[PDB]
């Protein structure tokens, strides 16, 4: 729990479920298989500076 320790170690949206964290991502990404990180689907995803 404590989606306020360090964002529940999530990459984006942090969520609590009475006892622990539950990550999710902005529309356009897909949650990593480790429940925390978010990886894009297409090549130009929201939030990222086209560098």
């Amino acid at each position: 729990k404590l989606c306020s320790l360090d964002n529940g170690d999530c990459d984006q949206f942090c969520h609590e479920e009475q006892n622990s964290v539950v990550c999710s991502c902005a529309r356009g990404y897909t949650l990593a298989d480790n429940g925390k990180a978010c990886i894009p689907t297409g090549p130009y995803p929201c939030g990222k500076q086209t560098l």
Partner: protein, 235 residues
């Protein structure tokens, strides 16, 4: 954008620009999706008919990547009112889809409760536009960005001359000559978190530009999320 830095190449990819029949860029916007643009409600007044330009980082030299876009339908937030500037929000759906190239990408929408607790509680935010580089100077040629500190939900109200409502939020400085300005309206106020940007607010208003004991009044974006969606679905 009085002071601030120059939006370097591919640094402000969501920066949309509302232009008029005179090809002059009067207001700004933020890209939310291949079809939708987020803008300050009042903005739909400083023009008669407007086009939405994207990809431009300079108003006088073809960068090749720009592109114009016509508006198919304009979603002004009904309950808006110049007399108070409350509910200064609106949404434009493009006639044709935007094509994400470099310098052209959409910014993310955060989750309300998440945003309010992590995005806004954050130390600072990012505001950008082609607006004035001084309260009196002429509009800007290049695309500028100025990182602005968050302002106390209270000091905000005190310094003001008018009610800072629910849908409002301060951001900027109390003495530093840095702040958005004329023409910047509609612009994107973004918060950065782990190398990703979220649309936290809209460029709403202020009293003058970069004035002392005065700040920049933005539109609390998270105070309209569900509206913005209802909009992405059109309504």
């Amino acid at each position: 954008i009085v002071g601030g830095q120059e939006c370097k190449d591919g640094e402000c990819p969501w920066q949309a620009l509302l232009i008029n029949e005179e090809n002059e860029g009067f207001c700004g916007g933020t890209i939310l999706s291949e079809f939708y643009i987020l803008t300050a409600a009042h903005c739909l007044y400083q023009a008669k008919r407007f086009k939405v330009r994207v990809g431009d980082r300079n108003t006088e030299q073809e960068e090749g990547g720009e592109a114009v876009h016509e508006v198919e339908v304009v979603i002004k937030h009904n309950r808006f009112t110049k007399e108070t500037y409350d509910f200064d929000i609106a949404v434009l759906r493009l006639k044709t889809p935007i094509t994400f190239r470099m310098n052209v990408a959409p910014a993310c929408l955060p989750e309300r409760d998440w945003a309010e607790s992590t995005l806004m509680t954050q130390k600072t935010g990012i505001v950008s536009g082609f607006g004035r580089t001084h309260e009196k100077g002429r509009q800007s040629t290049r695309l500028k960005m100025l990182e602005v500190p968050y302002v106390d939900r209270n000091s905000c109200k005190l310094s003001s001359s008018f009610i800072i409502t629910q849908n409002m939020f301060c951001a900027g400085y109390d003495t530093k000559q840095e702040d958005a300005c004329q023409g910047d309206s509609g612009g994107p106020h973004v918060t950065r978190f782990k190398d990703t940007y979220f649309v936290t607010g809209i460029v709403s208003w202020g009293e003058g530009c970069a004035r002392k004991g005065k700040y920049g009044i933005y539109t609390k974006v998270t105070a309209f999320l569900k509206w913005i969606d209802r909009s992405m679905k059109t309504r």
